[PDB]
Amino acid sequence: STGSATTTPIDSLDDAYITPVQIGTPAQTLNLDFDTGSSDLWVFSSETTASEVDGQTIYTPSKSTTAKLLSGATWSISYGDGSSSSGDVYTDTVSVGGLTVTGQAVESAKKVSSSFTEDSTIDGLLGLAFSTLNTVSPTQQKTFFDNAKASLDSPVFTADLGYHAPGTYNFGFIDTTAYTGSITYTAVSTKQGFWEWTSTGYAVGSGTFKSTSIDGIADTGTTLLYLPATVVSAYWAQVSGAKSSSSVGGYVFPCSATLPSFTFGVGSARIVIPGDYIDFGPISTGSSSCFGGIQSSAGIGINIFGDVALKAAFVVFNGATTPTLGFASK
């Protein structure tokens, strides 16, 4: 089998992407944030504290003839941005782009933190990291990809995120029309539960390539590109007036600037992030200070190849017995 679904930016900045997901019988369609950096499929629901729902579409398990309470199971997750959610668990039928999994754990939120409530466009998350990170207790549950894998034509999914435009998540096949050149595959460590890999270096604008190993994670659920402070300083030093602002929480730059590109290495291959992809717009409405799309990872503990990086590529998440990642230009 295969599946193919369009993913759409939630706003004019590409702060996140939503993909429609069918849950239950009859189908209830929710728009979920596909997140290769986490491993829980959780949704706003009829169980979510009413004051914490503000415009989201909810899953109502009592209206699904295939929903079953997973007795005794609870979940609770905290994300790198400080947000969190928790609740109980059903199993139900879940379909993405024509690919159907029966018995998928659907984690129903009883509580969500304020940032989730405040984002009316995201109805939940669909985790695509390794199932060892799934938070369901006392019996850990499998991701949608893990459940579908054996049925897929090939044990892969691909992320093709757009810049200010829709893109595609495919399951079970590699669309050879969706990229240019060849796909360069690189090794993955699953030891932390992430799609963790090592970039071979970087360049700023038209500058020379610096060969240096940068271990990080391919994370569709993180907006920005988080890299070591040395790399980030070298990038922003090429932008007149750019500075790190403790009060804003990262590098800012004059909105009048034209940003240089940023290149990252994948083996001997190179992925170029155009400068425009690094502009996240005014720090507050009407400000002439703009927020940068490349930020330091120094306070995180891990480097994160988030959407800013991934949307410059066609990305293969290869879930073969030994997982690997593939990157192609597009």
Q: What is the DSSP string of 192-249?
A: TSS-EEEEEEEEETTSPPEEEEEEEEE-TT--SEEE-HHHHHHHHTTSTT-EEETTTT
By three-state DSSP, how is residue 75 classified? Answer: strand
Question: In this structure, what CATH number is given to the domain that contains residue 163?
Answer: 2.40.70.10
CB 220 within 8 A of CB 36: yes
Whether residues 90 and 104 fall in one domain: yes
Token pair for residue 222?
């993180």
Tell whether the torsion through CA atoms of 6, 322, 265 and 329 is positive or negative. negative
CA distance 126 to 19: 9
Name 303's bridge partners: 216
Whether residues 120 and 73 fall in one domain: yes
CB 146 within 8 A of CB 102: no
Burial letters 207-231, b for 16+ CB under 10 A, else e: eeebeeebebbbbbbbbbbbbbeeb
Report residue 193: phi and psi, to 5°: 85, 0
Whether residues 129 and 88 fall in one domain: yes
Respond yes or no: is residue 35 known to be catalytic. yes
Taking only Cα atoms into account, the Rg of the chain, rounded to an integer number of angstroms, comes to: 20
**Cβ contacts of residue 162 below 8 Å, gap of 6+?**
7, 9, 14, 311
Using CA atoms in the order 167, 170, 174, 175, what is the torsion angle rounded to 10 degrees? -40
Report residue 276: phi and psi, to 5°: -60, -30
Residue 151, number of CB atoms within 10 A of its CB = 14
Pairing of strands 303-305, 269-273: unpaired
Whether residues 170 and 184 fall in one domain: no
Determination method here? X-ray
- Name the residue with tokens 């500058």: 207
Whether residues 31 and 143 fall in one domain: yes
Whether residues 322 and 310 fall in one domain: yes
Find the catalytic residue in 38, 45, 108, 199: 199
CA distance 86 to 110: 6
Whether residues 37 and 128 fall in one domain: yes
Whether residues 183 and 77 fall in one domain: no
Q: Please report the resolution in angstroms.
A: 1.3
**Domain endpoint, select from 174, 203, 224:** 174
CA distance 284 to 245: 14
**Domain endpoint, select from 121, 154, 174:** 174
Residue 236, number of CB atoms within 10 A of its CB = 23
Using CA atoms in the order 300, 145, 133, 25, what is the torsion angle rounded to 10 degrees? 110
**Cβ contacts of residue 9 below 8 Å, gap of 6+?**
15, 16, 17, 162, 164, 165, 166
- Name the residue with tokens 């590409």: 14
Token pair for residue 250?
């990262």
Whether residues 109 and 148 fall in one domain: yes
Residue 90, number of CB atoms within 10 A of its CB = 25
55-58: Cβ within 8 A, 24+ apart: 55/120, 56/120, 56/122, 56/123, 57/28, 57/29, 57/30, 57/31, 57/123, 58/30, 58/123
Domain residue limits at 271: 175-330
Find the catalytic residue in 35, 119, 160, 279: 35
By three-state DSSP, how is residue 69 classified? Answer: strand
Residue 314: how many CA atoms within 13 Å on its side-chain side?
A: 18
Q: What one-character DSSP code corresponds to residue 258?
A: P
Respond yes or no: is residue 54 known to be catalytic. no
Gaps in the chain (C to N over 2.5 angstroms) fall after none
CA distance 71 to 89: 8
CA distance 128 to 23: 17
CA distance 209 to 200: 10
